[PDB]
Amino acid sequence: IPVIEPLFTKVTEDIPGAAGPVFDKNGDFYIVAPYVEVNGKPAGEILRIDLKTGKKTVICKPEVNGYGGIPAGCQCDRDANQLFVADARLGLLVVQTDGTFEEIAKKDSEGRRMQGCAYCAFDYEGNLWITAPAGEVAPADFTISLDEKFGSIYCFTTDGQMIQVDTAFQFPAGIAVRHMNDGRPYQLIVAEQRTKKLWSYDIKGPAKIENKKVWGHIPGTHEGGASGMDFDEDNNLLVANWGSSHIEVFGPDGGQPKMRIRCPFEKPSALHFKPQTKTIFVTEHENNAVWKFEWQRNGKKQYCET
Numbered sequence: 050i051p052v053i054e055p056l057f058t059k060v061t062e063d064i065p066g067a068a069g070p071v072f073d074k075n076g077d078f079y080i081v082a083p084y085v086e087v088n089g090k091p092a093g094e095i096l097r098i099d100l101k102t103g104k105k106t107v108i109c110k111p112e113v114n115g116y117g118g119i120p121a122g123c124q125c126d127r128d129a130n131q132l133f134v135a136d137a138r139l140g141l142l143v144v145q146t147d148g149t150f151e152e153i154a155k156k157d158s159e160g161r162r163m164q165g166c167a168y169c170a171f172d173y174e175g176n177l178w179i180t181a182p183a184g185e186v187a188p189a190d191f192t193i194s195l196d197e198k199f200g201s202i203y204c205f206t207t208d209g210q211m212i213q214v215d216t217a218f219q220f221p222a223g224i225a226v227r228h229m230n231d232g233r234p235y236q237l238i239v240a241e242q243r244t245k246k247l248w249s250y251d252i253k254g255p256a257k258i259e260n261k262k263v264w265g266h267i268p269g270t271h272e273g274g275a276s277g278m279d280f281d282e283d284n285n286l287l288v289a290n291w292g293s294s295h296i297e298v299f300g301p302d303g304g305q306p307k308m309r310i311r312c313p314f315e316k317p318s319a320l321h322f323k324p325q326t327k328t329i330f331v332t333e334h335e336n337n338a339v340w341k342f343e344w345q346r347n348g349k350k351q352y353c354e355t
């Protein structure tokens with residue numbers, strides 16, 4: 050498998066659990082710090098990053114009824130400049146740039162308590178596909194599906210339904226939507242981190258997925274596996290391989306990586322393209338920092354750019 054070794058440039062540092070890189074509609078850059086603690090308990094943060102200096106501004110320190118959040122992954126909305134944030138303690142948040150936030154759902158459409166969420170991805174129809182590797186949200190005790198298969202997959206639809214669409218995953222992590230060239234949502238890809246598998250489904254409509262199959266396999270002997278992922282404009286899937294020091298590059302049909310991207314750090318946790326550029330911003334847990342590098346082509350347009 051060919052490997053490339055592009056130059057990485059440091060963006061910012063000192064971010065506990067750095068993850069959830071995202072750009073809003075104005076081009077501002079944000080990340081999450083899931084692992085910040087105060088008085089011995091979770092107190093994670095959502096931060097805006099000055100791209101010139103790497104200066105960090107805390108946007109939001111989400112807490113609900115005295116239970117602090119573990120914000121873990123982000124996407125930007127289209128019709129309003131607001132961030133959808135997957136939170137491993139609080140479920141799904143909508144965070145405004147002014148710092149105000151709302152917990153969007155605490156129960157699914159079957160009436161059961163939400164599971165804590167980690168990554169999410171909008172399709173072009175505005176439905177948000179979400180991985181939930183944690184156990185029940187606060188006030189339940191915090192657990193994650195690293196060793197047991199209780200992680201779940203949700204779709205939060207444009208009608209405001211939070212629908213559990215699959216379950217029994219061993220730490221579901223990155224998630225991405227592949228669209229037809231004409232814009233129709235076609236496939237959902239889900240990383241099952243602790244089985245080294247990427248799963249695909251056919252998207253038949255809002256919260257409707259069928260044809261579940263193993264789509265690709267993640268290399269590596271390390272502890273970990275696929276974390277965050279996103280498509281480039283050719284529908285190659287770039288997949289951070291936590292613990293392997295690489296981002297894997299899959300062609301549209303999956304299988305084994307057709308190329309690897311060597312990183313100067315062990316634990317890439319998430320990645321996100323800067324809009325209308327070939328620049329990928331990468332969070333990582335070796336140094337708890339953010340970097341950028343130049344890919345071969347632009348990213349796939351995100352929902353917020355449509």
Ligand SMILES: O=C1Nc2ccccc2[C@@]23OCC[C@@H]2C[C@@H]13
Nearest residue numbers: 066068083121222275276291318
């Ligand atoms: O892929 C991963 N994504 C994220 C994202 C946010 C916070 C922590 C993590 C992880 O850190 C070790 C346990 C968990 C698996 C890694």
